[PDB]
Design a protein around this ligand. Structure first.
Ligand SMILES: CCCCCCCC/C=C/CCCCCCCC(=O)O[C@@H](COC(=O)CCCCCCCCCCCCCCC)COP(=O)([O-])OCC[N+](C)(C)C
Ligand SMILES: CCCCCCCC/C=C/CCCCCCCC(=O)O[C@@H](COC(=O)CCCCCCCCCCCCCCC)COP(=O)([O-])OCC[N+](C)(C)C
Ligand SMILES: CCCCCCCC/C=C\CCCCCCCC(=O)O[C@@H](COC(=O)CCCCCCCCCCCCCCC)COP(=O)([O-])OCC[N+](C)(C)C
Ligand SMILES: CCCCCCCC/C=C\CCCCCCCC(=O)O[C@@H](COC(=O)CCCCCCCCCCCCCCC)COP(=O)([O-])OCC[N+](C)(C)C
Ligand SMILES: CCCCCCCC/C=C\CCCCCCCC(=O)O[C@@H](COC(=O)CCCCCCCCCCCCCCC)COP(=O)([O-])OCC[N+](C)(C)C
Ligand SMILES: C[C@@H]1CC[C@@]2(OC1)O[C@H]1C[C@H]3[C@@H]4CC=C5C[C@@H](OCCC(CO)CO)CC[C@]5(C)[C@H]4CC[C@]3(C)[C@H]1[C@@H]2C
Ligand SMILES: [Ca+2]
Lengths: 90, 90
């Protein structure tokens, strides 16, 4: 989760000062991704259907690649390993 | 994923020139479908609650049938096979 959250925030929000909101932003949306949410119209902030058009900038085309890797790891590896854990220890 | 993505794009967007955006569009939404997103108001683009009314045209009534088959295959067959793989190899 943190491996994803910290780059996502740093790439999309560079002009930020220190604040405790940084601690929420690196942890909040990545957690909710585990639970069926995708933030579809926040991926690819430079698209025409985007809800974050003010956030388009240099290097933002990276964040869809990052999130694709993130959810591959959490669901296809880690959620199913956890299912497999319980099935074999029940 | 590609078996679905290529027809979906071709039927809904016919008047397109060559571009590398075609490589994103055949792969992007089908991937996010695996992870709990449905794009509910983009199915049946000719409906009244649709968010893509400019995309209604000849042959677009096919894309709900395609997506129904797609998700049947990915979740009910392929995600559960993968769960069954891990449970039996753990
Ligand atoms: C993994 C590491 C990640 C990083 C974290 C490390 C650092 C941790 C940080 C620690 C200190 C944070 C200090 C915040 C100070 C400023 C807040 C402020 O001004 O008011 C905010 C209140 O915000 C709160 O009341 C936050 C309370 C602390 C958060 C919980 C700490 C973490 C542990 C949890 C343990 C349990 C977890 C679950 C497990 C059981 C008000 O903001 P708002 O109202 O929302 O918005 C403005 C609107 N307004 C006008 C109404 C005001
Ligand atoms: C399966 C087969 C599918 C088909 C693929 C085959 C072909 C592959 C293609 C390859 C070449 C693509 C060339 C694109 C050139 C144009 C881009 C451009 O103009 O700028 C874009 C940057 O876009 C990029 O920087 C894209 C970077 C390459 C994509 C990754 C390659 C695939 C491998 C990945 C490996 C890892 C995968 C994960 C696994 C670990 C800017 O666009 P934007 O900013 O978003 O929007 C405009 C806004 N603006 C005003 C700010 C500019
Ligand atoms: C070991 C594992 C290897 C995996 C294989 C490799 C994976 C395939 C790799 C890559 C596919 C091709 C990548 C994009 C091609 C270039 C895009 C481009 O030029 O412009 C686009 C930039 O768009 C971006 O920069 C975002 C790139 C898409 C990220 C895809 C992640 C999710 C899907 C991947 C995961 C599922 C993969 C399923 C595989 C079948 C936009 O077009 P434009 O003209 O620049 O601007 C349009 C204007 N607009 C922005 C305002 C609308
Ligand atoms: C992978 C196999 C090779 C595939 C093909 C080649 C791809 C590979 C390599 C190269 C592609 C990198 C360059 C793409 C530039 C296109 C976008 C552009 O025009 O400008 C970009 C700026 O970007 C920069 O200024 C630098 C960006 C790249 C540096 C970081 C490297 C990340 C990958 C390193 C590791 C990857 C290794 C991963 C291996 C799995 C985007 O910004 P903009 O669009 O100018 O936005 C203007 C916005 N404005 C108007 C508000 C100001
Ligand atoms: C399956 C058992 C049989 C069931 C009953 C019969 C069904 C079976 C057969 C036949 C039904 C096909 C004709 C439907 C036409 C109705 C829509 C219409 O009015 O025009 C259509 C145009 O469409 C065309 O011009 C041609 C469409 C059919 C060709 C492709 C065949 C696909 C299925 C072949 C394989 C299937 C096999 C699958 C087997 C599992 C849609 O366009 P429009 O509405 O005119 O839109 C106007 C928009 N405008 C105003 C912007 C311009
Ligand atoms: C392994 C883990 C990963 C790394 C990590 O944990 C361990 O390392 C920690 C360091 C933290 C920052 C240290 C100092 C400050 C300054 C403070 O300044 C108040 C400014 C204003 C408030 O409104 C009042 O003037 C704001 C918070 C900030 C930037 C921390 C954010 C969280 C960070 C990045 C944490 C991060 C999650
Ligand atoms: Ca969901």
């Amino acid at each position: 989760l943190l491996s994803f959250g910290v780059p996502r925030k740093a790439i999309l929000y560079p002009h930020e000062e220190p604040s405790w909101s940084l601690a929420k932003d690196i942890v909040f949306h990545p957690y909710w991704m585990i639970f069926g949410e995708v933030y579809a119209y926040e991926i690819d902030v430079c698209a025409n259907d985007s809800t974050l058009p003010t956030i388009c900038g240099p290097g933002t085309w990276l964040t869809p690649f990052l999130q694709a890797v993130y959810l591959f790891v959490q669901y296809i590896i880690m959620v199913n390993l956890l299912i497999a854990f319980f099935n074999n220890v029940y």
